[model samples]
Target: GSHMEVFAEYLKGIDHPDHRDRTEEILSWVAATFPNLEPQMKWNTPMFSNQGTFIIGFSTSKHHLSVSPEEIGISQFADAIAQAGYSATKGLFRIPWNDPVHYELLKQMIEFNIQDKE
Candidate 1:
């Protein structure tokens, strides 16, 4: 029951190698950082959840990568993320995939979001 096919669909839509690699990196970091959060592929994107609420999602387009802390508006770490070039107006944060994934900052944000969820 692996979602490998869905993941392949995601890879097919992407053109840049960095974007795909970065997306994988971020997803790996998230699953590791928040072990309590389960990684599941939903709608062809990677999503994580804890306490029955989805905490983070990863996706990429031709131009940008996404680190979707789907709970951003209610998340306390939104301001800190904004300082790190992540602007969360509603739910999604449109991050640039060409650059290295900010696993450090992302780890902090994931912790914050997870704590808030409970």
Candidate 2:
């Protein structure tokens, strides 16, 4: 998908090596975990969709990477994710690249977000 390619390039654009790698890995995991989803680039960011409906978009920051679901993260999984040390808001989950990723839970969250798109 063009978005994947664009995301890959975007990650490469980052000045921080660790952050770039982490962003790439997370985005790769997103693609791998959601085979049914299609990705497209919007405003230089990667937006994923299935059945023509937007599911999520991912971007990077200096200290973290953001996954945009446009949902209230705290109400949805505050305790669980906080235990994993991720800070999130209504539309975004901010993950620090230096920390270990809670992949199993993130996988679950991705599925939840996809299911909600319909």
Candidate 3:
């Protein structure tokens, strides 16, 4: 699965232009940050994984974008996410299209997930 193919499908499925753009930006950042990982589609959403273990994923809703780093990844960064004024659950977090994304926190989460998977 190529990144652009999944990305195109993602954008096509999302109705909101802003949501599509933001989702792309976030996913692009994740890809650039972890170039070693390949982008693939799983459950009709974009995900990055290594050796069948998921590192991160992104999905869109009518209201917000979902960033999923899997359960373990979210647990390790729960505190930072809370301190940054973002809410997270066992496996997912929300970012509104209008709100600024916490990329630094996402970077940390990605790194943590990579190490944990290893």
Q: Which predicted model would earn the best TM-score?
A: 3
Which 10 consecutive positions of candidate 1 have the poorest summed lDDT?
1-10
lDDT of 1 by residue, 25-117 (tens): 565555566768765668867676684577677677666766656665326666766777665446655666545555676677668766776
Lowest-lDDT window of 10 residues in candidate 2?
A: 68-77
Model 3 residue runs over 4 Å out of place are none
Q: On a 0 to 100 scale, what is the lDDT of residue 36 in model 1?
A: 82
Model 2 lDDT per residue over 1-118, tens place: 5446656776667878855776666677777878787777778877777756766777777787777554644467756887777788766777787886677866776688667655
Q: Each candidate's TM vs. the true structure?
A: 0.70, 0.81, 0.86
Give the CA lDDT, 0 to 100, for residue 22 in model 2.
64
For model 2 the local lDDT of residue 113 reads 69
Candidate 2 achieves a global lDDT of: 0.70
Which should have the higher TM-score, number 2 or number 3? 3
Q: Candidate 3 — which pairs collide?
A: none
